[PDB]
Swiss-Prot record, chain C:
Compartments where found: Secreted; Cell membrane
Result for mutant: residue 435 to R: Enhanced ability to activate the classical complement pathway
GO cellular component terms given for this protein: extracellular region; immunoglobulin complex; plasma membrane
Protein name: Immunoglobulin gamma-1 heavy chain
């Protein structure tokens, strides 16, 4: 278990002096000699000398005799190496090794070869005071994929003394990584570069941040190597929203006719708001029924508009009795960007009711040559215009139909037409179609008229 | 003095092959005081052979050193995976302690062309006054590769520095990263910035480039 | 022509003195007394006194009876005003005014009002001295960019843009007197933000009194050197509505189709409105405007009518109406044309009264018209070659396949129906063969 | 002695409208020696009426003067575009020459909101030792406005000067320009600068601003 342990790395300046230790064990310390060999960057190993623990006898290399001091301490089992007047060139790893076993058949010094070494101790000798690493991105540009991938990395330039550790994505990214060995600059600062190849596609999708470390200056840095944006302050200025209105504006809407007449549905009065600047998006509504306020309202979330405006809406599901009686509703809205509180009122269209006459009309003979025919429903004589027209057959609702809007007639009442389109076959198969009309001036607010091919078939 | 010249510079073979290291000295070494050492990055050098031909304790009989007079050898019957390292020779004793320059036993693998990527100076860095133009050469083999810069087709020199990685543990390839460094003044007085790469795997010099501020 | 011309502007220092001249013309100089009136900035006109060229007589204002001297040279048809011991308060425009004619039935001095005035000579009194202006531009951030002419003396200062090239939008502001005794004026000019980087703007400031002349570029700031679809403004003023021709007019040779441009909310303040029409870009001058109409809500309604050629309209020519009013920042433009899209010929179907309706005194004859495009169409009812009266047609309505349909309802006494009379539903649409089709309807 | 008071201070009418100017006197003018003058900025004053009711030569029959004792009136039956200007009454003759303060007949148009802008002090000026921030209100009506500077959220005062142009011949609108004067010393003491404008065509007082600094 013959082992040799040396001191730790050290960093001196041009003129200082270093003293490295060398402690052994596993063998008789004063029964062997200790050599001292260094190896500077790019240089061959250099033997400096040797000292003998048993009698302190030491031989020096012509190149270090005048500057080295081999001093042993048998009590501690440690050999010391001391170099002084250290200049730059003296930078290197200084090892200490023990001679080999003095065999029987060998002559004096035949065993003086480096038998067991130590891990050496690095010694940097320069006039560069500690500094912090620089983190610059080696980002990929939009080059040609052709038949390959992309590469990006980090540059750790101008620091002292080394080392430095680099990782990508807090130890998540390892494969493909290549941290290059430091390079001492004419400035006396080490340079470094860590790179990684990754699929070209992932560029815009994956996040790559290299973690840089440099303990000597207790510095840490994490930079996101992001692909250089191909945009040079691409022209198109900040703060793109308008402002030439007496604040936002309000518009109110009444419930749908059928809803007010038929029970299956509940009345809904909508209050919409637009032109709600982004500087003041907060909106508040208030509801007054004939003056008497109520909070049973519900406000749907806000949405964004094309030209930088919002669409806030408050739907106050009102009641049949209220609406039909002529109850007056009011939606008051106030916004900070608005000078005055905008409030609007809504209520059922009043007027002397007139009972609608419903008439179904079969297809014209000429249209019978087509594959689809028109079943017509005429509704006339009604007032007010609020009405609902629906079509059904065999207990089910037809789909394909369109009703004209109410049209003012010669006498002040309204009339309209609803057109149901159905395949000629259904008409000829004798199916019975019926037009349902829902209006306030109808008994039970409901009436029906049927239509079907003359008896025949 | 005694000068030891090792050969070959780099010895690349596949596991199982026979390795022979040469170490010639300017003087004859009749003392037979020749020794061989193995060295691995970060670890402590290890004695392999001593006295010309004597395995050190713990050395597989795979190793064996012979020679005399002016020429000495070291051979591995069959190369193992853990053998790939640096091998030096030296003459020792009687105040004659000198080493060889070392021979590198590397991993032999198929020829591989380098993937060359180039990166222009970072926007931020330009704030200081220095420009760092990097040029990568990814996972190539063998090691020998030439890198030339051309700023406006002007073969630069003496302003760049290289760096290389240890043979890749997995695919036995290397990667080099040259660095062009100028003043923000020079960088903004030229347009074409290329990095010419010549390799044993590239039929013709590959040139990756860009121009002063152009995405 | 009575001419009262006075001398150039003066610039004196406190305690100094000034003497203004006034040369009379077009009348017998010595037949009218000449008054001297001044007006200090922000002050009322001050009468200083008068002199009678006839006899050399003079009258003074108690306020100026000590330091003013009225002299006159009969031969030189000129009067002079000499004010000494000038203070700061003496800075004003000094006027020279002549009395009116005197007639036998005037009482002495009934004509001593100021009949004819001079343009007035401005006299500035201060301690400061001639200084050059400091041109400091007002770069952009429509956007307006201008210049700033600071600390100068004495007035005036001439500022121009692009050497008199740019006029519209330029606002050279009146100067202000800084307590330092120097003036500071600022001229601006709102310019289309679209030329912030394509145009070169420089003011040409000149200060003859000091022989200064500095031109300065007014270019944007270095923060950046892509139009989606910006939205128009609304200063709440006039509003234009361009209407298409009556469909019937576009299909009959005996009718004359016209596109109508209506401008509403035309202020009583500025009722004048200018109309500019364009057919596919080319301007036309056949339009005709109608007399304005007073709206119940105190505004005006102005209508311009442009007749069009049947074929021009049916072939899809665009009609642009350009409205201009003093209250309008920029004139409003509106364009219209017949709808685009495959023409589709209409189907015409007549439907008799529902059996149930036959119990009433009046029944409904129905004309279904469907499958047509564009929606422009004309429907009529006739009988015995004569046009019926009592019918209403619903507006066109969009059907499931993209075309339109509509119904027309004719009302007639159950009598006429029962008697077997024949009625016809006439339809005029561009996509019909010969643009016209009919469908009869009768009992049995 | 005699003091003449004109009312209203300003008459805002439309061509075709009826204009009535009032002139009150502290004394009764039995001499009936009252005159009315028209004055267009930059032009020589014109005599419109003399002897309280006699029209001056070349004056439109549209102008008529009346009154007696202590009250005198100038009236224009139907205003014409070139009738807009200052109008002054006056008592003359026998050491009694005094003028009224003036009534401004301005053209009335529909309210027009001002386009408020705010400029930063040109750098060249800052280094000089002074700083001027100008807030421009463009093409508005009526004449009266209210520009209140807000120095880094503060009710500034007594260091700014206004200046209004004459109603535009075309659009009939006024444009104001308030200049904020403060040394670079005080200029480089607060972060942001504001300028509030209270016009009639603005129910919500507008305040355009800029953050002191670069861009």
């Amino acid at each position: 278990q013959v082992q040799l342990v040396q001191s730790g790395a050290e960093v001196k300046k041009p003129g200082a002096s270093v003293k490295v230790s060398c402690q052994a064990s596993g063998y008789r310390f004063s029964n062997f000699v200790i050599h001292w060999v260094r190896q500077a960057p790019g240089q061959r190993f250099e033997w400096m000398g040797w000292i003998n623990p048993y009698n302190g006898n030491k031989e020096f290399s012509a190149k270090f005799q005048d500057r080295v001091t081999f001093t042993a301490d048998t009590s501690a089992n440690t050999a010391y190496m001391e170099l002084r007047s250290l200049r730059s060139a003296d930078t290197a790893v200084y090892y200490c090794a023990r001679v080999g076993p003095y065999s029987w058949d060998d002559s004096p010094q035949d065993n003086y070869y480096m038998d067991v070494w130590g891990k050496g101790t690095t010694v940097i000798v320069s006039s560069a005071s500690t500094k912090g690493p620089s983190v610059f991105p080696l980002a990929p540009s939009s080059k040609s994929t052709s038949g390959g991938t992309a590469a990006l990395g980090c540059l750790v330039k101008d620091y002292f003394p080394e080392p430095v550790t680099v990782s990508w994505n807090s130890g998540a990214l390892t494969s493909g990584v290549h941290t290059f060995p430091a390079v001492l600059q004419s400035s006396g600062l080490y340079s470094l570069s860590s790179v990684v190849t990754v699929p070209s596609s992932s560029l815009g999708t994956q996040t790559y941040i290299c973690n840089v470390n440099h303990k000597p200056s207790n510095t840490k840095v994490d930079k996101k190597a992001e692909p250089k944006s191909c945009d040079k302050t691409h022209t198109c200025p900040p703060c793109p929203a308008p402002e030439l209105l007496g604040g936002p504006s309000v518009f109110l809407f009444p419930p749908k006719p059928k809803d007010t007449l038929m029970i299956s549905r509940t009345p809904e009065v909508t209050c919409v708001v637009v032109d709600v600047s982004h500087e003041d998006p907060e909106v508040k509504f208030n509801w007054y029924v004939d003056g008497v306020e109520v909070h049973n309202a519900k406000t749907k979330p806000r949405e964004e508009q094309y030209n930088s405006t919002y669409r806030v809406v408050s739907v106050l599901t009102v009641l049949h009795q209220d609406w039909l009686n002529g109850k007056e509703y009011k939606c008051k809205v106030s916004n900070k960007a608005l000078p005055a509180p905008i409030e609007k009122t809504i209520s059922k269209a009043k007027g002397q009711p007139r009972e609608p006459q419903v008439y179904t009309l079969p297809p014209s003979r000429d249209e019978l040559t087509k594959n689809q025919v028109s079943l017509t429903c005429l509704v006339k004589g009604f007032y007010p215009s609020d009405i609902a027209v629906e079509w059904e057959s065999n207990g089910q609702p037809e789909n394909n139909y369109k009703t004209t809007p109410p049209v003012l007639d010669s006498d002040g009442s309204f009339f309209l037409y609803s057109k149901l389109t159905v395949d000629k076959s259904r008409w000829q198969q004798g199916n019975v179609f019926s037009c349902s009309v829902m209006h306030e001036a109808l008994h039970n607010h409901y009436t029906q008229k049927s239509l079907s091919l003359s008896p025949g078939k | 003095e005694i000068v030891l010249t090792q050969s070959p510079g780099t010895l690349s073979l596949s596991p199982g092959e026979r390795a022979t290291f040469s170490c010639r000295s300017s003087h004859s070494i009749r003392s037979r005081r020749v020794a061989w050492y193995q060295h691995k990055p970060g670890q402590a050098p290890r004695l392999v052979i001593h006295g010309v031909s004597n395995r050190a304790s713990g050395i597989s009989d795979r190793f064996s050193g012979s020679g005399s007079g002016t020429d000495f050898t070291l051979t591995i019957t069959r190369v193992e995976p853990e053998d790939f390292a640096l091998y030096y020779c030296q003459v020792y004793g009687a105040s004659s302690y000198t080493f060889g320059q070392g021979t590198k036993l590397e991993r032999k693998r198929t020829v591989a062309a380098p993937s060359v990527f180039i990166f222009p100076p970072s926007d931020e860095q330009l704030k200081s006054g220095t420009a760092s133009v990097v040029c990568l050469l990814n996972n190539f083999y063998p090691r020998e590769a030439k890198v030339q810069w051309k700023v406006d087709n002007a073969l630069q020199s003496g302003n760049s520095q290289e760096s290389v990685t240890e043979q890749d543990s997995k695919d036995s390839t290397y990667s080099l990263s040259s660095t062009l460094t100028l003043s923000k003044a020079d960088y903004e007085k030229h347009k074409v910035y290329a990095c010419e790469v010549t390799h044993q795997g590239l039929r013709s010099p590959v040139t990756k480039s860009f121009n002063r501020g152009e995405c």
